[PDB]
Amino acid sequence: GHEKVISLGFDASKGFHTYAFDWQPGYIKWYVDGVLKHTATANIPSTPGKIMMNLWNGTGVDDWLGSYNGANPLYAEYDWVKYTSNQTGGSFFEPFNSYNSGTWEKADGYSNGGVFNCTWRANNVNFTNDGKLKLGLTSSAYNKFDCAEYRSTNIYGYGLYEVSMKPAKNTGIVSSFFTYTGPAHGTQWDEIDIEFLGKDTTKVQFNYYTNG
Ligand SMILES: [Ca+2]
């Protein structure tokens, strides 16, 4: 519950920008195109997590996300992700040339439920020819939505997380880049987020949870 909404001074859906968070034992610092935007120092997470990206439509959170109006198909794109480790032999660079089942997995066949109003499908996670991860939010039947979530198989710790992306624009949805660990992985709920609320892509929301 440490939400911070920052003005970008640009529309993030119009092209690629680099977003990042430096996660260290005593702070979290977030950057947009190399520029420091926000610092947090109270109760900073410490459990290593998976790197995740998704796109989804919400329900019951109209005041936060705006109401979703069924517009589809909608796409969020990611050109690369870089993690610079505090430890040697931990760093990696992922260009998104193709699906690498050794390091990533696609969510498929279930819903997160709750505020999430869509089912994850492996078919909505595709790779463009010019190397971009492309997540899609589609519909298979009247008012029935399918969404996409790509996530690392390994867990990562303190260090610099960077991503080049272009979020979707549309009332009711979220395009995100985040680290996560929680009861499903046998640990406490630690997460750090970069979330773009589709209702206004001229702003970005930063958040984190420690033992949520
Ligand atoms: Ca790429």
Side-chain angles (χ1 to χ4, degrees), residues 78-80 93-97 130-133:
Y78 302 79
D79 191 7
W80 46 264
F93 179 67
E94 168 61 64
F96 299 131
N97 289 329
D130 56 345
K132 304 165 182 149
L133 203 230

Side-chain angles (χ1 to χ4, degrees), residues 197-211:
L197 313 186
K199 52 149 168 194
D200 178 355
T201 47
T202 74
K203 299 178 197 213
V204 68
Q205 185 183 291
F206 302 136
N207 202 10
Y208 63 104
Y209 299 95
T210 296
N211 207 7

Side-chain angles (χ1 to χ4, degrees), residues 185-199:
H185 312 271
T187 80
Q188 60 189 66
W189 170 25
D190 279 0
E191 165 175 354
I192 295 150
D193 307 299
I194 293 168
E195 286 162 306
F196 294 97
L197 313 186
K199 52 149 168 194

Side-chain angles (χ1 to χ4, degrees), residues 63-181:
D63 275 359
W64 178 41
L65 302 182
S67 1
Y68 180 50
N69 62 357
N72 67 104
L74 296 170
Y75 307 90
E77 298 166 31
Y78 302 79
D79 191 7
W80 46 264
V81 157
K82 190 175 164 52
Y83 167 60
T84 302
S85 207
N86 272 17
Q87 68 155 93
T88 318
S91 287
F92 79 84
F93 179 67
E94 168 61 64
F96 299 131
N97 289 329
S98 58
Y99 178 35
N100 183 348
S101 66
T103 55
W104 306 88
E105 116 211 323
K106 318 171 167 191
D108 187 50
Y110 63 92
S111 170
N112 274 13
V115 304
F116 290 84
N117 198 18
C118 58
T119 304
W120 305 116
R121 302 289 173 190
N123 290 326
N124 289 24
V125 177
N126 290 295
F127 296 83
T128 73
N129 282 279
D130 56 345
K132 304 165 182 149
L133 203 230
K134 177 146 111 158
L135 296 196
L137 172 53
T138 58
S139 179
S140 54
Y142 183 66
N143 266 176
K144 289 207 148 350
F145 305 99
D146 290 322
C147 53
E149 174 173 276
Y150 201 50
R151 57 197 195 226
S152 77
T153 49
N154 295 127
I155 54 162
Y156 301 96
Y158 290 124
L160 184 67
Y161 287 81
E162 309 181 273
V163 63
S164 185
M165 67 184 269
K166 180 157 56 77
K169 183 177 183 130
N170 206 86
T171 184
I173 69 171
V174 171
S175 325
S176 74
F177 173 79
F178 64 106
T179 46
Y180 176 87
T181 190

